Structure formats: structure tokens, C-alpha cells
Assembly symmetry: C2
Homo-oligomer: 256 residues x 2
């Protein structure tokens, strides 16, 4: 008898310890984004200052070199044709000459972000990432003079999500898998992938809209064994306010 009272107490503790482990991982991903956004704020303020084009390229280059999860940055200046540049990682950085999200951002004077997409890199590879768009202001902090685009590599979060583990999912807009040990799931919705357990995907998709966190059980269509699932949301753009600031999600699974 008391065996069975012990087994329900231990299951409670398994679920809560799983939730703590997920929370630790969420904070780790938020802290990567926050390191990047701190540097990005400083570049945003310094890029429109009264500096030669070459200073500005040094600034963008050192921003990317310092931020491992940034795969490229772009500046566009309204009234300067020599300040419309992209930098992308290759071995070090490659400079290349030459906009709805950016047009929006300059007009609302507000940080924007794109949906996840693949972008080609100097060595023919394709990096899955999101653009973050920021207005650049003149000295008086009122006139918009340009835009800064930061390409955040979602693949870079392999250091946090898939490194020596395969039990973690990074989930994004509308249930899309952004990153997971199984690269075949990238860019596909959990509603498609996990159609065999509709209560689960729909409980998960609720938590993703509502923010919040939760645990459940579901039958994994790949392993065919029963799995504990724990999910937890955070705001990808952090504090901000922008209409574009959505919940991302990290999911953690454990075989029952």
C-alpha cells in the first residue's frame, strides 16, 4: 500500500525537478539573448554618431565577433548610399554591399523582428535565424536616420539545446520547432509533428499563447514509449513592447 503512496509522491517530485531543470535552461537561453541585446543597444546608439564609414564598419564587425549567436548585421542609412552594408560570418567577417520590417521599424521608431527564415552565408551554407530591426536616430534622438538589422542565428542555440543532449526543443511562432536534436523537425509545427496526441499539442499551444508553463504526458510517435513533457515560455525580445515580441518556448522530455 504505502508503496503506492510513495510512487505518487515520487512522481510529483520527478515532475517538479524536471520543471526546475527546464527553468534553468530557459534562463540560460534568455541570458544569451540578453548578452546580445546589451551590446546591440550600445551599437544602436553609437552607429549614427558622427564617425567615418570605416569606424562604423569596425563597430559592426566587433559587435558580431563579440556575439557568437549573431550571424550577421546590416546598416542602412537613409541619406548615405555608402552606408548600406551587410556583414556576415564566414571564417571571420565578410562585407557585402546591400525592406518591409525595416521600413516599419523606421516609421514606428520601434524594434521589430522577422519570422524565422533560412539565409545563405558566404560559404554556401544556410543558417536558420530571425532578423531584429532597430531604428537609428540622429543626435537629437527624434529624427530617424536609418536602420540596423541583427540576424540572430537560431542554429547557434545548439550550444544550449542540443549539446550533449537530445531531450530539448526550442519552439517559436505558432508551435514551429525552431531547434531540436532531430534536425528534420526544424521549421515544422508541433501540430503536424505531434498530430497523434491532439490533447497534448493543443494544451502546449495554449501555454505558448497564454505564456505560462506546464507538465503533461503523451505518447511519443518516434520512440513509442510514454514521455513526461514540460514546457515553459519566455519573451524572445525581453522587456521591449513591440507588437512583434512573441513567446518562445523550451520543451523538455523524459521517458516515463
Amino acid at each position: 500500500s504505502l508503496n503506492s503512496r510513495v510512487k505518487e509522491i515520487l512522481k510529483e517530485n520527478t515532475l517538479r525537478s524536471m520543471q526546475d531543470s527546464l527553468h534553468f535552461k530557459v534562463k540560460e537561453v534568455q541570458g544569451v539573448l540578453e548578452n546580445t541585446y546589451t551590446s546591440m543597444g550600445i551599437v544602436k546608439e553609437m552607429l549614427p554618431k558622427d564617425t567615418k564609414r570605416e569606424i562604423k564598419i569596425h563597430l559592426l564587425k566587433n559587435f558580431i565577433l563579440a556575439n557568437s549567436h549573431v550571424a550577421g548585421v546590416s546598416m542602412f542609412f537613409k541619406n548615405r548610399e555608402d552606408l548600406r552594408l551587410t556583414l556576415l560570418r564566414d571564417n571571420d567577417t565578410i562585407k557585402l554591399m546591400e525592406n518591409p520590417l525595416a521600413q516599419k521599424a523606421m516609421k514606428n521608431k520601434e524594434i521589430s523582428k522577422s519570422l524565422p527564415y533560412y539565409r545563405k552565408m558566404p560559404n554556401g551554407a544556410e543558417v536558420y535565424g530571425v532578423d531584429i530591426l532597430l531604428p537609428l536616430l540622429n543626435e537629437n534622438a527624434q529624427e530617424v536616420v536609418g536602420a540596423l538589422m541583427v540576424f540572430i542565428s537560431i542554429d547557434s542555440f545548439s550550444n544550449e539545446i542540443t549539446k550533449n543532449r537530445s531531450d530539448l526543443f526550442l519552439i517559436g511562432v505558432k508551435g514551429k520547432v525552431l531547434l531540436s536534436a532531430n534536425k528534420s523537425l526544424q521549421d515544422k509545427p508541433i501540430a503536424e509533428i505531434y498530430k497523434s496526441v491532439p490533447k497534448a499539442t493543443n494544451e502546449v499551444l495554449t501555454i505558448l499563447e497564454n505564456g505560462s508553463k506546464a507538465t503533461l504526458e503523451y505518447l511519443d510517435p518516434f520512440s513509442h514509449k510514454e514521455n513526461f513533457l514540460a514546457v515553459e515560455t519566455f519573451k524572445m525580445l525581453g522587456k521591449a513592447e513591440s507588437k512583434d515580441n512573441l513567446n518562445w518556448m523550451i520543451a523538455l522530455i523524459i521517458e516515463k
Copy 2:
């Protein structure tokens, strides 16, 4: 027999659990520090570029405004006496001064250096406990040192992570110096002396500090006169950066033994 076996089992789970809680706190503190180390790396690279004095000050102002645990930032140029400036937090604003800004050794070293903890006089008359991180500024060819950037990290500002809404955590530094705890009068004192009534405990902690490990133990608290569990964990204060001046800091977590 079932009761004792289960009680030992629960006790290990409890130590293990407070190590998890402490590791979380260590990564939060290291996250805060990484905000600053990433951006001071950019500042380090941009400062000696060919820009006007007024651009260099804007960059320093932006750097300190964006890093809440930075309480002062300074630039020194070997050959430009107009670029010898300090920005200090003055209550809620920033205060520019041109004072006479170890910094020798930093410029001779070409690696990132660090001071020992000290009490810095602030413009509002208060003293802030922190450390200077010193970064050399290199010319174009990355080979010759033209000056230094110094970043004063306020240890006191980690109260948000260590002592806000709790009193069970300690930040510990060089040779067991207490850097931050809820009992303000421990600051800057060695645990060897604070906890002299438990010499086996301090010997163990001090050993973990030098070996860069983690552990748990039990000790009788000289202040509450109750027995405590104690978990400790070291981390490299400068994080990923190689440096002669790097060392282990530590966070410690205590819990009254008769509450778990």
C-alpha cells in the same frame, strides 16, 4: 529501519537539491557578469580607433548606462592627456571627471587584469565595494598598447542577486574574503576569522575555493547558534577570459538543518 533508510535517502536528495539551487544562482551571477564582459570587449576595441574625444565619451556613457552592475568606467591614453577620464555613478546619474587614472602592469601584460576588492569613494560621498577590471587598448596592428580601459564592477550591486528577499547566500572571493552577504558587517572579512568557531568547515571551504570545486557540509552557525547545511560552488570570476589575475569566486548557500 525503513524510517532511517528513507531519512538518509531524503537527506542526500536535499543536499543534491540545494546544489542545484546554488548552481542556478552561480549561472545567474555569471550571466550578469557576461553582459558586461561582452560589451566591454566592444568598448575595448572601439576606444583606440580614430574617433574624436566626444565619441569616446559617448561610448563610455553608453557602456555604463547599459550595465547596471558597472559603477565606474575609465579610459587612460599613454600619449593623449585629454583622454584621461572617469565616469562614476553619482546617485542616479553619471558624473564625468578628469582624474589621474596596476594600470601599468595591465598595459605591460596585454591580457585582461583585475584588482583586488576595494572601497571606492563615490561622488555622492558613499563608498562602493567593487573591483577594477583593466583592459589594454591596442593600436591598429593589435600589437602595441596605447592605453587602458578600466571598469569598476560594483560588488554591492549584486545585492539584487544575493541579498534581495533572502539572507542565505554569500559571495566569497580571494582567500575566503566575504564580498557580499546579508550581514553587512561581514563584508571584506575572511571567513577563516568569521567562522573561527568551526575550523574544519572553513578549512573545507577554503580548500574548495582553491581547487575550484563544489561541495556540501554541515556546521554550527556562530550567529543563529543552530546547525546549518552549507553548499558552496566556485566559478571563474572573469569567466571565459584567460588572465593571470583570474581567480575563483564562490557562492555559498546555507539552510538551517532542522528545517529540512
